[PDB]
């Protein structure tokens, strides 16, 4: 069988910060941008969507400390992230986005309003750590490694490092942990990764925190997983049909995953599906902000603009919430803030599935309903 992962507590990694393995900078960094003939006075429709507006008369995530593991961020008044470490350059801070990545997903987590346009962050009042786990614009140090070997390989690695900075978010302080990163696997070429479930155990059981994973997007090493099969009724969700792992997303319910949708609703076509999605949330067509605090929503592609787009922006309004609903009920456990956000979704047409567990949150019901 296909097994759920087994969480060994005993097997917590080192806090340390820096990559698993030597890290060089081979490009320029990118920066984001804008569609020609945007108008960022209205508001963004997935803040318009999930209702912000309304649920900010009941929390601002003032008080609340959300970590923020992704591509690092230039920090801004309207983001004023705080270093929290860098896992790709071994000399750095998580205060350096060379991917226009990570700044925009703290912004839409925790980014401040301004009188001059509609955008503002889900948790605006929240502070924001910033740990830098990824980035596009460096390479590994050519090093010798053996190449039939999944625990070589930079995923191996990637999961490595990634769960020292769990270990380093959760002694941060954070109360809400946001991970963009969602990598993948093929079932049949375990990676050994016992140190990314400590971690998140130790973040949740140990240090109080809410974890929040991305589903992770289709593409390259992400093959979409096939639906459940109905005419196995003892695994509903699934577990058996899995070809694709994505980590650190399939520790849930220890984690809350977040699945991707559109402006229509519809769960979106990048969106990795899998037994371990909780819940999802707006990851298409994005409005954010870039490395001055200004509103961006287009990012430069192969051949030209292409949107801000995935399911690391639909777990940022998930992480948002979380901060919302810690912020008003500062008694809940970090069990009880996911069961909360789940149980207040709006369900899909077959009451949980693959591909939006529970459902597209909604804010105002989580904090009022
Ligand atoms: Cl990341
Ligand atoms: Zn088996
Ligand atoms: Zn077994
Ligand atoms: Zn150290
Ligand atoms: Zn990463
Ligand atoms: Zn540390
Ligand atoms: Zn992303
Ligand atoms: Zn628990």
């Given at each position: 069988?296909?097994?759920?992962?087994?969480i060994?507590?005993?097997?917590?990694?080192?806090?340390?910060?820096?990559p698993?393995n030597?890290?060089?900078?081979r490009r320029?960094?990118a920066?984001?941008?804008?569609?020609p003939?945007?108008?960022?006075?209205?508001?963004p429709?997935?803040?318009?969507?999930?209702?912000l507006?309304?649920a900010?008369?009941?929390?601002?995530?003032?008080?609340?400390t959300?970590?923020?593991?992704?591509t690092?961020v230039?920090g801004?008044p309207?983001?004023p992230?705080?270093?929290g470490?860098?896992?790709?350059?071994?000399?750095?801070?998580?205060?350096?986005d060379?991917?226009?990545?990570?700044?925009?997903?703290?912004?839409?987590?925790?980014?401040?309003?301004?009188?001059?346009?509609?955008?503002?962050?889900?948790?605006?009042?929240?502070?924001?750590?910033?740990?830098?786990?990824?980035?596009?614009?460096?390479?590994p140090?050519g090093?010798?490694?053996?190449?039939?070997?999944?625990?070589?390989?930079?995923?191996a690695?990637?999961?490595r490092?990634l769960?020292?900075?769990?270990?380093?978010?959760a002694?941060?302080?954070?109360?809400?942990?946001?991970?963009?990163?969602?990598?993948?696997?093929?079932?049949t070429?375990?990676?050994?990764?016992?140190?990314?479930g400590?971690?998140?155990?130790?973040?949740?059981?140990?240090?109080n925190?809410?974890?929040?994973?991305?589903?992770?997007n289709?593409?390259?090493?992400?093959?979409?997983?096939?639906?459940?099969?109905p005419?196995?009724?003892?695994?509903?969700?699934?577990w058996?049909?899995?070809?694709?792992?994505?980590?650190?997303?399939?520790?849930?319910?220890?984690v809350?995953?977040?699945?991707?949708?559109?402006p229509?609703?519809?769960?979106?076509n990048?969106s990795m599906?899998?037994?371990?999605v909780g819940?999802?949330?707006?990851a298409?067509?994005?409005?954010?902000?870039g490395?001055?605090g200004?509103?961006?929503?287009?990012?430069?592609?192969?051949?030209?603009?292409?949107?801000?787009?995935g399911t690391?922006?639909?777990?940022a309004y998930v992480?948002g919430?979380?901060?919302?609903?810690?912020?008003?009920?500062?008694?809940?456990?970090?069990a009880?803030?996911?069961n909360?956000?789940?149980?207040?979704?709006?369900?899909?047409?077959?009451?949980?599935?693959?591909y939006?567990?529970?459902?597209?949150?909604?804010?105002?019901?989580?904090?009022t309903?």
């Amino acid at each position: 069988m296909i097994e759920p992962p087994v969480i060994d507590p005993a097997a917590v990694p080192p806090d340390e910060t820096g990559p698993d393995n030597p890290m060089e900078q081979r490009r320029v960094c990118a920066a984001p941008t804008v569609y020609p003939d945007s108008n960022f006075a209205d508001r963004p429709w997935a803040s318009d969507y999930l209702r912000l507006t309304e649920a900010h008369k009941f929390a601002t995530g003032a008080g609340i400390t959300v970590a923020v593991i992704d591509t690092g961020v230039n920090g801004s008044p309207r983001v004023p992230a705080e270093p929290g470490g860098d896992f790709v350059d071994a000399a750095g801070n998580g205060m350096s986005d060379c991917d226009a990545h990570g700044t925009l997903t703290a912004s839409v987590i925790a980014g401040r309003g301004a009188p001059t346009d509609g955008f503002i962050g889900v948790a605006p009042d929240a502070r924001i750590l910033s740990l830098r786990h990824t980035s596009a614009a460096f390479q590994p140090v050519g090093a010798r490694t053996d190449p039939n070997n999944p625990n070589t390989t930079q995923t191996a690695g990637s999961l490595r490092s990634l769960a020292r900075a769990i270990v380093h978010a959760a002694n941060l302080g954070a109360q809400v942990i946001n991970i963009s990163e969602a990598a993948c696997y093929k079932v049949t070429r375990p990676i050994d990764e016992t140190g990314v479930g400590a971690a998140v155990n130790y973040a949740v059981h140990v240090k109080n925190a809410v974890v929040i994973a991305a589903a992770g997007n289709t593409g390259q090493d992400c093959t979409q997983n096939p639906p459940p099969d109905p005419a196995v009724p003892s695994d509903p969700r699934g577990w058996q049909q899995v070809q694709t792992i994505v980590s650190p997303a399939w520790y849930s319910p220890l984690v809350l995953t977040v699945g991707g949708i559109g402006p229509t609703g519809q769960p979106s076509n990048f969106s990795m599906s899998g037994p371990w999605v909780g819940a999802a949330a707006p990851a298409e067509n994005i409005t954010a902000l870039g490395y001055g605090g200004e509103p961006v929503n287009a990012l430069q592609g192969q051949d030209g603009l292409v949107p801000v787009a995935g399911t690391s922006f639909a777990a940022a309004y998930v992480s948002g919430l979380a901060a919302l609903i810690r912020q008003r009920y500062p008694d809940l456990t970090p069990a009880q803030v996911i069961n909360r956000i789940t149980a207040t979704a709006r369900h899909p047409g077959g009451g949980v599935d693959n591909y939006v567990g529970a459902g597209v949150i909604d804010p105002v019901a989580a904090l009022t309903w």
